[PDB]
A paper describes a structure:
Here we report the investigation of the role of protein flexibility in the modulation of binding kinetics and equilibrium thermodynamics of drug binding to heat shock protein 90 ([name]). [name] is one of the most abundant proteins in the cytoplasm of eukaryotic cells, comprising 2–5% of cytosolic protein under non-stressed conditions. It is a ubiquitous molecular chaperone intimately involved in a variety of pathways, including cell signaling, proliferation and survival, and protein folding. The N-terminal domain of [name] (N-[name]) contains the nucleotide-binding site, which has been the target site for drugs interfering with ATP binding and ATPase activity. The unbound N-[name] has a highly flexible lid segment comprising residues 107–14137.
We determined crystal structures of the N-[name]-[name] mutant in the apo-state and in complexes with representative loop- (1, 6) and helix-binding compounds. However, the complexes with the loop binding compounds 1 and 6 exist in two alternate conformations after [name] mutation: loop-in and loop-out, with increased mobility as indicated by higher local B-factors. ITC experiments for compounds 1–20 reveal different effects of the [name] mutation on the thermodynamics of loop- and helix-binders. Although the binding affinity is marginally impaired for the N-[name]-[name]-complex with compound 1, the thermodynamic profile is very similar to that of the WT, with a major contribution of enthalpy to the binding. This suggests that loop-binders do not change the conformational distribution of the protein upon binding significantly, or that the thermodynamics of the bound- and unbound-states of the protein are similar (the available crystal structures suggest that the unbound state may be in either loop-in or loop-out conformations).
Residue numbers in the entry:
A (entry chain B): 17 to 223
B (entry chain A): 17 to 224
The structure:
């Protein structure tokens, strides 16, 4: 298990997301589904010139998996996935400018719901999750598990458990008071409200 | 000059964009600036592992160039650009599956303004333009010019004209009744409304 420090600005944004009073927490789902949609666009585009890129799975979809026993909400996509380098480097220098701009926007009166306009929508997961695990598989690399309970660090390890073929699984280990996001009617409402017209099928799993 | 036929679905999308009554045409600028921003993110991401990727130009910006004499609005970016193969792939879009999903969404009550969510935002240019010319230069290919007045075809040719170093120029040949998009105050209003949080400087050029 390798341990890494978040880029300073990402650590600052994470503490802002965890500590700022903001009731409209439900936007985390919109942001994650948006990232899933973008990753799906990427593999679909690559497959136009090289169809073998879909040998790891032809279905391009998003699955929402609530689990009340584990207190987890999992967002699965069969997108392009991330290599070990992207998985690490995403929390590095690339995200510095967008994070810096977002925190400046917030100081100027912008809303936390605008996070996605700064390319850092992923960190909205910390509005509802105490810990986030990212399982990912890109065609050019092995399966890796990224994990962080914030605190300025994250870990990356090889994931040998259950191979996924290709894509990303975002496992949200929900805060004790955020279990409404495990309720079928609540998830349906949020999807209809914020992600009604996504370019890929969204399947809400039953418990 | 090579001439290509659009696939049936992308042809149907362009025809819908041209013929459907939809007054909120100004979203074309948000969509093009969004594509420019994404192309700029791509080159900036690649510049970190390989700094030589910026030898073709270090400045990362978006320029809006109205020209009332030519009746054109040009959107210039110093993004990653597009290869010839990208241009032939419906100007780097997931046009086939994107159109299919977008058409299905429109039938389910979605608005034309949601086009960009389907990876076909570029074709919103046809809300205001009778013809679109795309001049592009990717680090891994030569400079090319893509062009289409819709009508089921597009052309791709090598562009030996003024080099751009790296990036994309989208030249909108405006419809006769869409000249408001050449007005300084109109462009400023649209940029403020739909693109205030763009991560790259947007420069609106002055005329005369």
């Amino acid at each position: 298990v390798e341990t890494f420090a978040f880029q300073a600005e990402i650590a600052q944004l994470m503490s802002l997301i965890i500590n700022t009073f903001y009731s409209n927490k439900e936007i985390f789902l919109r942001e994650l589904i948006s990232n899933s949609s973008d990753a799906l666009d990427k593999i679909r585009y690559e497959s136009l010139t090289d169809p073998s890129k879909l040998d790891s799975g032809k279905e391009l979809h998003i699955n929402l998996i609530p689990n009340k026993q584990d207190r987890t909400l999992t967002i699965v996509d069969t997108g392009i996935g991330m290599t070990k380098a992207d998985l690490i480097n995403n929390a590095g220098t690339i995200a510095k400018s967008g994070t810096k701009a977002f925190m400046e926007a917030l100081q100027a009166g912008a809303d936390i719901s605008m996070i996605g306009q700064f390319g850092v929508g992923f960190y909205s997961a910390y509005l509802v999750a105490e810990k986030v695990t990212v399982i990912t598989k890109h065609n050019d690399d092995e399966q890796y598990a990224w994990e962080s309970s914030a605190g300025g660090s994250f870990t990356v390890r090889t994931d040998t458990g259950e191979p996924m073929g290709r894509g990303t699984k975002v496992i949200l280990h929900l805060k004790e008071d955020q279990t409404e996001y495990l309720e079928e009617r609540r998830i349906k409402e949020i999807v209809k409200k914020h992600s009604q017209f996504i370019g890929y099928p969204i399947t809400l799993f039953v418990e």
